[PDB]
Each structure stands twice: as C-alpha cells, then as structure tokens.
Write a protein that holds these residues in place. Structure first.
Motif, PDB file in Angstrom:
ATOM      1  N   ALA A 235       1.060  -3.343   9.062  1.00 47.18           N
ATOM      2  CA  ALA A 235       2.075  -2.306   9.215  1.00 47.18           C
ATOM      3  C   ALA A 235       2.071  -1.370   7.983  1.00 47.18           C
ATOM      4  CB  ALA A 235       3.454  -2.932   9.408  1.00 47.18           C
ATOM      5  N   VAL A 236       2.013  -1.942   6.780  1.00 43.94           N
ATOM      6  CA  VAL A 236       1.999  -1.128   5.546  1.00 43.94           C
ATOM      7  C   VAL A 236       0.731  -0.275   5.498  1.00 43.94           C
ATOM      8  CG1 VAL A 236       1.895  -1.172   3.006  1.00 43.94           C
ATOM      9  CG2 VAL A 236       3.614  -2.529   4.219  1.00 43.94           C
ATOM     10  N   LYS A 237      -0.418  -0.862   5.830  1.00 40.60           N
ATOM     11  CA  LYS A 237      -1.675  -0.099   5.829  1.00 40.60           C
ATOM     12  C   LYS A 237      -1.565   1.121   6.772  1.00 40.60           C
ATOM     13  N   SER A 238      -0.981   0.923   7.981  1.00 37.98           N
ATOM     14  CA  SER A 238      -0.812   2.029   8.910  1.00 37.98           C
ATOM     15  C   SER A 238       0.222   3.068   8.458  1.00 37.98           C
ATOM     16  CB  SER A 238      -0.495   1.503  10.311  1.00 37.98           C
ATOM     17  OG  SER A 238      -0.357   2.582  11.217  1.00 37.98           O
ATOM     18  N   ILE A 239       1.394   2.619   7.936  1.00 36.63           N
ATOM     19  CA  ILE A 239       2.444   3.526   7.471  1.00 36.63           C
ATOM     20  C   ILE A 239       1.907   4.378   6.307  1.00 36.63           C
ATOM     21  CG2 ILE A 239       4.743   3.669   6.376  1.00 36.63           C
ATOM     22  CD1 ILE A 239       5.379   0.997   8.069  1.00 36.63           C
ATOM     23  N   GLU A 246       1.761  12.488   0.969  1.00 37.02           N
ATOM     24  CA  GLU A 246       2.343  12.080  -0.304  1.00 37.02           C
ATOM     25  C   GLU A 246       1.861  10.688  -0.668  1.00 37.02           C
ATOM     26  OE1 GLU A 246       6.321  14.867  -0.199  1.00 37.02           O
ATOM     27  OE2 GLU A 246       6.578  13.017  -1.370  1.00 37.02           O
ATOM     28  N   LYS A 247       1.582  10.480  -1.960  1.00 38.72           N
ATOM     29  CA  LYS A 247       1.110   9.205  -2.472  1.00 38.72           C
ATOM     30  C   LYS A 247       2.250   8.452  -3.128  1.00 38.72           C
ATOM     31  CE  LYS A 247      -2.313  10.915  -5.401  1.00 38.72           C
ATOM     32  NZ  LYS A 247      -3.669  11.516  -5.307  1.00 38.72           N
ATOM     33  N   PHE A 248       2.356   7.163  -2.826  1.00 39.45           N
ATOM     34  CA  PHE A 248       3.400   6.316  -3.371  1.00 39.45           C
ATOM     35  C   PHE A 248       2.781   5.169  -4.124  1.00 39.45           C
ATOM     36  CE2 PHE A 248       4.981   8.461   0.385  1.00 39.45           C
ATOM     37  CZ  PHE A 248       6.114   9.064  -0.113  1.00 39.45           C
ATOM     38  N   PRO A 249       3.450   4.642  -5.170  1.00 42.05           N
ATOM     39  CA  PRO A 249       2.886   3.480  -5.872  1.00 42.05           C
ATOM     40  C   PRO A 249       2.863   2.259  -4.956  1.00 42.05           C
ATOM     41  CG  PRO A 249       4.986   4.104  -6.825  1.00 42.05           C
ATOM     42  CD  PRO A 249       4.753   5.057  -5.733  1.00 42.05           C
ATOM     43  N   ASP A 250       1.856   1.372  -5.132  1.00 40.01           N
ATOM     44  CA  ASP A 250       1.697   0.140  -4.339  1.00 40.01           C
ATOM     45  C   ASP A 250       2.987  -0.669  -4.265  1.00 40.01           C
ATOM     46  OD1 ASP A 250      -1.016   0.674  -3.810  1.00 40.01           O
ATOM     47  OD2 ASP A 250      -1.797  -0.933  -5.117  1.00 40.01           O
ATOM     48  N   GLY A 251       3.698  -0.752  -5.393  1.00 37.76           N
ATOM     49  CA  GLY A 251       4.966  -1.458  -5.544  1.00 37.76           C
ATOM     50  C   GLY A 251       6.091  -0.937  -4.657  1.00 37.76           C
ATOM     51  N   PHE A 252       6.035   0.355  -4.257  1.00 40.76           N
ATOM     52  CA  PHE A 252       7.057   0.949  -3.389  1.00 40.76           C
ATOM     53  C   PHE A 252       7.028   0.206  -2.043  1.00 40.76           C
ATOM     54  CE2 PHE A 252       8.092   4.123  -0.005  1.00 40.76           C
ATOM     55  CZ  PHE A 252       9.427   4.296  -0.303  1.00 40.76           C
ATOM     56  N   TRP A 253       5.811   0.004  -1.503  1.00 41.84           N
ATOM     57  CA  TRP A 253       5.638  -0.678  -0.212  1.00 41.84           C
ATOM     58  C   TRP A 253       6.036  -2.169  -0.279  1.00 41.84           C
ATOM     59  CZ3 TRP A 253       5.451   3.184   2.924  1.00 41.84           C
ATOM     60  CH2 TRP A 253       4.761   4.357   2.580  1.00 41.84           C
ATOM     61  N   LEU A 254       6.114  -2.736  -1.501  1.00 45.49           N
ATOM     62  CA  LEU A 254       6.496  -4.127  -1.732  1.00 45.49           C
ATOM     63  C   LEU A 254       7.974  -4.271  -2.113  1.00 45.49           C
ATOM     64  CD1 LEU A 254       3.320  -5.166  -3.881  1.00 45.49           C
ATOM     65  CD2 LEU A 254       3.654  -5.563  -1.399  1.00 45.49           C
ATOM     66  N   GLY A 255       8.708  -3.150  -2.155  1.00 47.62           N
ATOM     67  CA  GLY A 255      10.122  -3.120  -2.520  1.00 47.62           C
ATOM     68  C   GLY A 255      10.393  -3.385  -3.992  1.00 47.62           C
ATOM     69  N   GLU A 256       9.349  -3.295  -4.832  1.00 49.39           N
ATOM     70  CA  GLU A 256       9.418  -3.524  -6.283  1.00 49.39           C
ATOM     71  C   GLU A 256       9.715  -2.221  -7.028  1.00 49.39           C
ATOM     72  OE1 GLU A 256       6.317  -7.280  -5.864  1.00 49.39           O
ATOM     73  OE2 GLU A 256       5.558  -5.375  -6.670  1.00 49.39           O
ATOM     74  N   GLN A 257       9.387  -1.083  -6.406  1.00 49.65           N
ATOM     75  CA  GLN A 257       9.640   0.247  -6.961  1.00 49.65           C
ATOM     76  C   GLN A 257      10.414   1.099  -5.982  1.00 49.65           C
ATOM     77  OE1 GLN A 257       5.213   0.317  -8.317  1.00 49.65           O
ATOM     78  NE2 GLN A 257       6.207   2.097  -9.243  1.00 49.65           N
ATOM     79  N   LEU A 258      11.289   1.953  -6.519  1.00 54.31           N
ATOM     80  CA  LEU A 258      12.032   2.920  -5.727  1.00 54.31           C
ATOM     81  C   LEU A 258      11.427   4.289  -5.984  1.00 54.31           C
ATOM     82  CD1 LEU A 258      15.693   1.873  -6.725  1.00 54.31           C
ATOM     83  CD2 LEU A 258      14.341   0.849  -4.915  1.00 54.31           C
ATOM     84  N   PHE A 309      12.034   0.905   0.289  1.00 59.49           N
ATOM     85  CA  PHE A 309      11.305   0.682   1.539  1.00 59.49           C
ATOM     86  C   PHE A 309      11.892  -0.647   2.044  1.00 59.49           C
ATOM     87  CE2 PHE A 309       7.307  -1.035   3.686  1.00 59.49           C
ATOM     88  CZ  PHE A 309       7.209  -0.057   4.658  1.00 59.49           C
ATOM     89  N   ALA A 310      12.505  -0.598   3.221  1.00 61.10           N
ATOM     90  CA  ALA A 310      13.243  -1.729   3.767  1.00 61.10           C
ATOM     91  C   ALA A 310      12.521  -2.483   4.892  1.00 61.10           C
ATOM     92  CB  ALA A 310      14.638  -1.288   4.192  1.00 61.10           C
ATOM     93  N   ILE A 311      11.192  -2.532   4.801  1.00 65.66           N
ATOM     94  CA  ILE A 311      10.355  -3.378   5.646  1.00 65.66           C
ATOM     95  C   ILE A 311       9.761  -4.351   4.670  1.00 65.66           C
ATOM     96  CG2 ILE A 311       8.386  -3.590   7.262  1.00 65.66           C
ATOM     97  CD1 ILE A 311       9.037  -0.604   8.036  1.00 65.66           C
ATOM     98  N   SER A 312       9.912  -5.646   4.923  1.00 64.96           N
ATOM     99  CA  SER A 312       9.446  -6.642   3.950  1.00 64.96           C
ATOM    100  C   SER A 312       8.781  -7.848   4.565  1.00 64.96           C
ATOM    101  CB  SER A 312      10.588  -7.059   3.027  1.00 64.96           C
ATOM    102  OG  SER A 312      11.648  -7.655   3.756  1.00 64.96           O
ATOM    103  N   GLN A 313       8.115  -8.629   3.719  1.00 67.42           N
ATOM    104  CA  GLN A 313       7.374  -9.791   4.163  1.00 67.42           C
ATOM    105  C   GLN A 313       8.257 -10.995   4.439  1.00 67.42           C
ATOM    106  OE1 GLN A 313       3.528 -10.212   2.067  1.00 67.42           O
ATOM    107  NE2 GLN A 313       3.974 -12.399   2.131  1.00 67.42           N
ATOM    108  N   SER A 314       7.889 -11.767   5.465  1.00 71.46           N
ATOM    109  CA  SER A 314       8.582 -12.996   5.824  1.00 71.46           C
ATOM    110  C   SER A 314       7.571 -14.126   6.084  1.00 71.46           C
ATOM    111  CB  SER A 314       9.385 -12.760   7.108  1.00 71.46           C
ATOM    112  OG  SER A 314       9.889 -13.992   7.591  1.00 71.46           O
TER     113      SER A 314
END
Ligand SMILES: CC(C)Oc1cccc(CN2CCC3(CC2)C(NC2CCCCC2)=NC(=O)N3c2cccc(F)c2)c1
Length: 369
Positions: A235-239, A246-258, A309-314
């Motif tokens: 899902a993250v790879k596709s989003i 726009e480019k976002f830091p890797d951590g944004f997709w992991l909820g570690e960066q805003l 980013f409010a999609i996260s791993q489970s």
C-alpha cells in the motif's frame, strides 16, 4: 427524524477518541465514555488519576453491587486493572431506558487514559467472546437488548470533533445515497472480509487472503487504518508512486515524521484515494468504500497545519479504525449479522464514496481459518 435527540451525542478531540455521556448509579454520576467497537467491557475510572477530571465513586451509589471478582484488560499500547460490579446505567442522549449492567471499576492503569481526551471510561460494544475475564461477563449492549425492547442495532457517524451514536435504529439525516452491507463473519470483534484494495483505481494485486490475515475488524476505538505487514508495504509503495509530484521522507510513511503545510495550502489533490472492496450480501457481489487523503492524513494539534500519515502496520490483522469510519455512516446491524456503510452527511474535486455492486468471484477464499 424520530432519532433526533441522539444526533450530535458524541464529542472528541482529534485523534483522541469519540465519547458519549453515560449516567451510572444512584444518585446519578455522569461520565464521558469512549465508544469502542473493538472491545467488549464497560469500564470506568473509579479512583483519582492525573488524566481524569472525574471518576466513578461506588460508595456514593446506593444501587452499586460488588461482583467480588477482579478484572484485568491488557493491550499492546495500554492496560487497566479493576473490580467487577453491576449498577444502573443510562445514556441521557441515547435510548430512553435504564439497565442494570456489568461495570468494571478501574482502580489502576498503565498508558490507558489519554491526557486531555476528556473521557473517563470505555464502552466496549463488541461481543461477549472477547469480554474479560471471559465470555460469561455480559457486555453492555447485550444487557440493553435483553432488558429492554431497544432493537439490536446501533449506528455511528464519526465526524473528523463530534458525531452521533444512534442506538436502536438508523437516522436518514446522517447519510446520503444508499447503505451497502457486508456480513459480520463471526461475532467476537466486528469481523468483516476485504476482497480487493485499490489506490487511485489501481488494484494492489495481492492474494485477498493477505488483506484479512489474521482478521479484518471495524474498530471505532483505533485511530488508524491498520494493515498487515505485507499489505502495508504494498500500500505504501503504491501511495508513494501515486503522490510522486511531491517527495516525502521515508519516516513520514512510517508515522515517525510529520509534514506541515502553511495554513490552508495542503495539496490534497496530489494524494490518491484508497478503495476497500467488501464482501456483499449476495453470492459473487461486492461493493467498495473510497476514502480521501483528508481521512488518512490526520491533523496533529499556528500558521502551519501538521499531518501524520494514519495508515500503519499491524501483526494482528486489518483494523478499519476512525480513518475509515470518518468518511461514513456505519450501521452495526447485530440483529441481521451485518455492517452497513453509506457516505456520511458530515473538497471541491473529490468525495468519499460507497459504490456497487461489483462482481468478485471466490470471495469465500479471502477469509482466515
Ligand atoms: C484513541 C486511541 C488512540 O486511544 C485509546 C486509548 C485507550 C483505549 C482505546 C481503544 N482501543 C483499545 C485496544 C487497542 C486499540 C484501541 C488495540 N486493539 C487491538 C486488539 C487486538 C486486535 C486488533 C486491535 N490494541 C491496542 O494496543 N489498543 C490500544 C491503543 C491505544 C491505547 C491502548 F491502551 C490500547 C483507544
């Protein structure tokens, strides 16, 4: 409508949960209670805590009955310990009834209450199978249905804050278009089956068993859309690919960066829509719910609007949390073992949608055993 007095009976602070007023004991003690379709215990803070504005005082309730048994409820992110009892309970902006319900008086807790959330307890709306200490402790909704003529159904409109919890029916002012239903697979959590996932109409192309490994649940108590590791990664790879302007830091997709934008300049149009297809009520028929970036990019509480980013791993299956529910009016039709979705009555280019029907074959194979 006939359910007008239940409209706008929920309140909340962004990302801190939605709560309803509940009146316990005699004379009345009103508290703010988190609405949680992902658990099955009714529990209230019953001793001082630095994050509680008020708490349940059993000694002041003449109708309180001690069950003389402790209860402990543990999770990955928090836990609580308390004492079981029963007391009279009413929901002033809910059904016009009073029931005697099980209540866990929380005396100690770890990372459970949230500083500034304004709620003091939890209303577990799921089934007895997941109640603590065991399935013999009748959940609140079961007591309500057994003791009164209130129909065995409730519906939630969570507005991303306030919202409505309609108990005993459906309020047509809360949604537009049609309601589409998916079966409740098993009565424990509100378990459902996801049969296809698209990012901007593009199929993620995973085996559908992955979307429901080891379960998919609808949970008003969880903030995010939580996805199993393999699904989260695809899902993250596709989003990321769809939002390439726009480019976002890797951590944004992991909820570690805003990432923060100047007030009112958030480029919503650059982020894709996400569609989850759910199993329908007829053989080989499905429908889809589509969420916008306004749902999966959550504001974090200035001249800058910060988002998480409010999609996260489970590792415990898919969790359709407030990120999903906020786009829709969700009907928990317990009587017919089904969950309904419709576009909620609460930008100028795109809207959340509930569409169907679609033809999806071998949907029975999507479920975990
Ligand atoms: C609004 C949220 C973030 O805050 C809270 C706070 C308390 C309770 C809840 C409802 N609620 C309680 C249970 C919950 C989700 C949110 C959970 N659910 C899983 C159970 C097993 C199957 C898959 C779902 N795992 C956690 O660690 N949780 C949690 C999360 C945050 C704090 C916590 F203590 C537990 C939510």
């Amino acid at each position: 409508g006939s359910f007008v007095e239940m409209v706008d009976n929920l309140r909340g602070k962004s990302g801190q949960g939605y709560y309803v007023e509940m009146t316990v004991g005699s004379p009345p003690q009103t508290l703010n209670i988190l609405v949680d379709t992902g658990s099955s215990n009714f529990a209230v803070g019953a001793a001082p805590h630095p994050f509680l504005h008020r708490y349940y005082q059993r000694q002041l309730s003449s109708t309180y009955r001690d069950l003389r048994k402790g209860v402990y409820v543990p999770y990955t992110q928090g836990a609580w310990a308390g004492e079981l009892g029963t007391d009279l309970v009413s929901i002033p902006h809910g059904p016009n009834v009073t029931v005697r319900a099980n209540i866990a008086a929380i005396t100690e807790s770890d990372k459970f209450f949230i500083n500034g959330s304004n709620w003091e307890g939890i209303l577990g709306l799921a089934y007895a199978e997941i109640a603590r200490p065991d399935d013999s402790l009748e959940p609140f909704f079961d007591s309500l249905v057994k003791q009164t003529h209130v129909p065995n159904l409730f519906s939630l409109q969570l507005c991303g804050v306030g919202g409505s919890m309609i108990i005993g029916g459906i309020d047509h002012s809360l949604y537009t278009g049609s309601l589409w239903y998916t079966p409740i697979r098993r009565e424990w959590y509100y378990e459902v089956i996801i049969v296809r996932v698209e990012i901007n109409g593009q199929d993620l192309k995973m085996d559908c068993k992955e979307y429901n490994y080891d379960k998919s649940i609808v949970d008003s108590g969880t903030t995010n859309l939580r996805l199993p590791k393999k699904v989260f990664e695809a899902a993250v790879k596709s989003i990321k690919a769809a939002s390439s302007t726009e480019k976002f830091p890797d951590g944004f997709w992991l909820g570690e960066q805003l990432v923060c934008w100047q007030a009112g300049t958030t480029p919503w149009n650059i982020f894709p829509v996400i569609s989850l297809y759910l199993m329908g009520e007829v053989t080989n028929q499905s429908f889809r719910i589509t969420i916008l970036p306004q749902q999966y990019l959550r504001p974090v509480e200035s001249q800058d609007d910060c988002y998480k980013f409010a999609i996260s791993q489970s590792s415990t299956g898919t969790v359709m949390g407030a990120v999903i529910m906020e786009g829709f009016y969700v009907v928990f039709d317990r009587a017919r073992k089904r969950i309904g979705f419709a576009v909620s009555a609460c930008d100028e280019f795109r809207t959340a949608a509930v569409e169907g029907p679609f033809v999806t074959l071998d949907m029975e194979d999507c479920g975990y055993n």
